[PDB]
Amino acid sequence: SGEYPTVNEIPVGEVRLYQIADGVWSHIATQSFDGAVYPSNGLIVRDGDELLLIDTAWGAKNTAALLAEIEKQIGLPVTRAVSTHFHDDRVGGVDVLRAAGVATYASPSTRRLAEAEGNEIPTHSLEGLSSSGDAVRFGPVELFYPGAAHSTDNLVVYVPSANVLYGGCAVHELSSTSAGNVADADLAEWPTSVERIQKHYPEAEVVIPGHGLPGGLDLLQHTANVVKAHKNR
Numbered sequence: 743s744g745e746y747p748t749v750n751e752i753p754v755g756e757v758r759l760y761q762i763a764d765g766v767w768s769h770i771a772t773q774s775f776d777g778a779v780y781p782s783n784g785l786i787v788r789d790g791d792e793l794l795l796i797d798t799a800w801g802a803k804n805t806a807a808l809l810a811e812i813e814k815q816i817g818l819p820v821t822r823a824v825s826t827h828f829h830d831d832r833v834g835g836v837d838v839l840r841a842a843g844v845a846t847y848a849s850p851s852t853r854r855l856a857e858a859e860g861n862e863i864p865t866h867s868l869e870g871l872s873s874s875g876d877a878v879r880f881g882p883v884e885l886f887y888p889g890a891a892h893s894t895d896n897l898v899v900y901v902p903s904a905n906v907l908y909g910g911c912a913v914h915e916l917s918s919t920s921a922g923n924v925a926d927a928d929l930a931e932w933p934t935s936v937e938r939i940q941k942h943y944p945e946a947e948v949v950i951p952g953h954g955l956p957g958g959l960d961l962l963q964h965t966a967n968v969v970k971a972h973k974n975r
């Protein structure tokens with residue numbers, strides 16, 4: 743169909759790529775957790791004749807399948823990866839990446855939280871992101887720390903050349919009726935953190951959630967709404 747792939751269309755262990763813009767793809771994979779199956783997204787951004795990866799494909803095998811799918815569909819090497827928070831849908835697979843020669847990065851807060859959780863730990867620390875509103879350049883993207891939301895460490899990623907906003911798990915898809923896995927969230931601060939994203943990236947044309955379908959800027963307000971519905975009741 744060429745439509746964005748959904749959870750029941752991707753067997754656990756396979757990876758799909760979806761072209762978002764020139765030189766920008768999302769990656770989609772599925773994984774089992776506590777007896778249910780979930781989809782999750784990451785990002786791939788062309789960096790000259792190299793690629794920057796945002797987030798693993800949620801597990802070692804899935805991430806190996808991601809590298810194979812990239813080689814098949816794109817044919818450029820992944821040289822660096824950034825994980826946008828400490829959960830396994832973001833760092834599970836970092837050991838696969840590192841063994842494949844990919845330099846792996848995350849904020850110090852993410853690295854500490856991953857270590858404490860028993861999750862895989864990116865090698866290199868990203869400084870300059872410890873205060874809400876901070877932004878740094880990393881290859882062809884900007885990394886932004888909006889404040890605590892889905893997790894205290896969540897980062898968002900903007901691709902200026904394409905006006906693509908990758909919200910990660912701080913941003914939910916439009917069809918969502920709940921706020922996802924809130925175990926490590928700050929539901930009170932989340933709406934303020936979304937407001938920071940909205941103020942910083944008013945020209946975003948595509949917004950990609952951590953799980954589910956991309957859309958436009960409406961995903962940001964929708965996320966604030968579903969988080970309030972959860973917090974309220």
Ligand SMILES: CC(C)c1cccc2c(-c3ccc(CS(C)(=O)=O)c(Cl)c3)c(C(=O)O)[nH]c12
Pocket residue numbers: 775780829830831892911914915917918919920921922923924952953
């Ligand atoms: C801790 C990690 C590894 C993890 C494990 C298992 C599930 C999740 C979810 C998640 C995402 C979407 C929905 C559907 S929804 C918006 O509620 O309609 C649901 Cl149920 C759960 C998330 C997330 O929210 O980022 N993380 C998960």
Ligand code: NA
Pocket residue numbers: 828829830831859861
């Ligand atoms: Na986790």
Ligand code: NA
Pocket residue numbers: 892893923924925926927
């Ligand atoms: Na959480």
Ligand SMILES: [Zn+2]
Pocket residue numbers: 827829831892893911
């Ligand atoms: Zn998470």
Ligand SMILES: [Zn+2]
Pocket residue numbers: 829831911952953
């Ligand atoms: Zn998530």
